[PDB]
Scaffold this active site. Structure first.
Site, PDB file in Angstrom:
ATOM      1  N   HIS A   1       0.868  -1.218   0.000  1.00 42.13           N
ATOM      2  CA  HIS A   1       0.000   0.000   0.000  1.00 42.13           C
ATOM      3  C   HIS A   1       0.892   1.253   0.000  1.00 42.13           C
ATOM      4  O   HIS A   1       2.122   1.109   0.030  1.00 42.13           O
ATOM      5  CB  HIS A   1      -1.086  -0.068   1.104  1.00 42.13           C
TER       6      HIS A   1
ATOM      7  N   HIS B   1       1.382   3.997   1.922  1.00 40.25           N
ATOM      8  CA  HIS B   1       1.909   4.685   3.120  1.00 40.25           C
ATOM      9  C   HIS B   1       3.426   4.473   3.251  1.00 40.25           C
ATOM     10  O   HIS B   1       3.963   3.519   2.660  1.00 40.25           O
ATOM     11  CB  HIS B   1       1.183   4.217   4.371  1.00 40.25           C
TER      12      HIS B   1
ATOM     13  N   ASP C   1       5.549   3.396   5.569  1.00 43.49           N
ATOM     14  CA  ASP C   1       6.117   2.145   6.130  1.00 43.49           C
ATOM     15  C   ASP C   1       6.204   1.082   5.027  1.00 43.49           C
ATOM     16  O   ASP C   1       6.933   0.108   5.244  1.00 43.49           O
ATOM     17  CB  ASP C   1       5.360   1.648   7.365  1.00 43.49           C
TER      18      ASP C   1
ATOM     19  N   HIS D   1      -7.484  -1.500   5.568  1.00 46.75           N
ATOM     20  CA  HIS D   1      -6.563  -0.504   6.155  1.00 46.75           C
ATOM     21  C   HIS D   1      -6.437   0.704   5.208  1.00 46.75           C
ATOM     22  O   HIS D   1      -6.400   1.830   5.705  1.00 46.75           O
ATOM     23  CB  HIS D   1      -5.201  -1.153   6.446  1.00 46.75           C
TER      24      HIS D   1
ATOM     25  N   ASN E   1      -3.786   3.154  12.932  1.00 44.93           N
ATOM     26  CA  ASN E   1      -3.927   4.285  11.987  1.00 44.93           C
ATOM     27  C   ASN E   1      -5.013   3.914  10.976  1.00 44.93           C
ATOM     28  O   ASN E   1      -4.735   3.081  10.102  1.00 44.93           O
ATOM     29  CB  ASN E   1      -2.598   4.601  11.292  1.00 44.93           C
TER      30      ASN E   1
END
Ligand SMILES: COc1ccc(O)c(-c2n[nH]c(=S)n2NCc2ccccc2C(=O)O)c1
Ligand SMILES: [Zn+2]
Ligand SMILES: [Zn+2]
Ligand SMILES: [Zn+2]
Length: 231
Positions: free
Chosen positions: A83, A85, A87, A148, A179
């Site tokens: 994904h 993001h 991280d 998520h 989150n």
């Protein structure tokens, strides 16, 4: 003995063989004064390696390649980010500089670009509709639908029954939602249901953060997501 948040200093990466030619990589990062662990996947593809997800930043990802170069000796040739993001894509420029071909869905690449984040170079086709599955060398990539994030992928290693859920799946120790700023809480349980219905055979289940477990981690994530929805 799975490496834990403690026994890894922020800047270092540990590897943890799961099966014949399948490792998790484990890193740590500081956010808001706390320290969190992070998981990705390494899958042997003949005489070279498929990387799933960065080690959460440029410094951790340069350490990850150095720890792969000490402990395994095979060249990472391709990487997939699950994904958009930081991280999952933070460290993509480090991977690219080293000669790694970086991949993400068009949706992940668009969302990364809007967010300002590192953008994997290559596009994964055929994952735009929930339930879509594509082969990528020694793994299947699966888009279960929004959870998520709207773009989140999961990775299955038919050879080994290793399901890598990324950040759509929570470890048992996590008893409250994390989150969820970019989450679809309404679609998250249905998306987990598509993962259960596509991969009942999975025997090892790796969350984005913390301990691996069984398929009980899917029902666990559904319990936490539903409790959060009803806050
Ligand atoms: C700059 O890096 C960051 C900072 C804070 C963050 O929440 C993240 C992040 N984006 N997507 C995910 S998943 N992130 N990490 C979340 C996180 C890290 C450790 C444990 C649980 C979670 C979670 O919220 O699920 C990335
Ligand atoms: Zn995220
Ligand atoms: Zn995550
Ligand atoms: Zn539980």
């Amino acid at each position: 003995e799975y490496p834990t948040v403690s026994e890894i200093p922020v800047g270092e990466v540990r590897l943890y063989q799961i099966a014949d030619g399948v490792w998790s990589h484990i890193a740590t990062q500081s956010f808001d004064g706390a320290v969190y662990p992070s998981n990705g996947l390494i899958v042997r593809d003949g005489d070279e390696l498929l990387l799933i997800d960065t080690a959460w930043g440029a410094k951790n990802t340069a350490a990850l390649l150095a720890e792969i170069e000490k402990q395994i000796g095979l060249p990472v040739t391709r990487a997939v980010s699950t994904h958009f993001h930081d991280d999952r894509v933070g460290g993509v420029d480090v991977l690219r500089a080293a000669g790694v071909a970086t991949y993400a869905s068009p949706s992940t690449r668009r969302l990364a670009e809007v967010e300002g984040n590192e953008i994997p170079t290559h596009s994964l086709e055929g994952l735009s509709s929930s339930g879509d599955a594509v082969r990528f060398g020694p793994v299947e990539l699966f888009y279960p639908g929004a959870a998520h994030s709207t773009d989140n992928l999961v990775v299955y290693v038919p050879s080994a029954s290793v399901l890598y859920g990324g950040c759509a799946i929570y470890e048992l120790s996590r008893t409250s939602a994390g989150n969820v700023a970019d989450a679809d809480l309404a679609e998250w349980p249905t998306s987990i249901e598509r993962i259960q219905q596509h991969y009942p055979e999975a025997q090892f289940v790796i969350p984005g953060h913390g301990l691996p477990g069984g398929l009980d981690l899917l029902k666990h994530t559904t319990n936490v997501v539903k409790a959060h929805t009803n806050r």
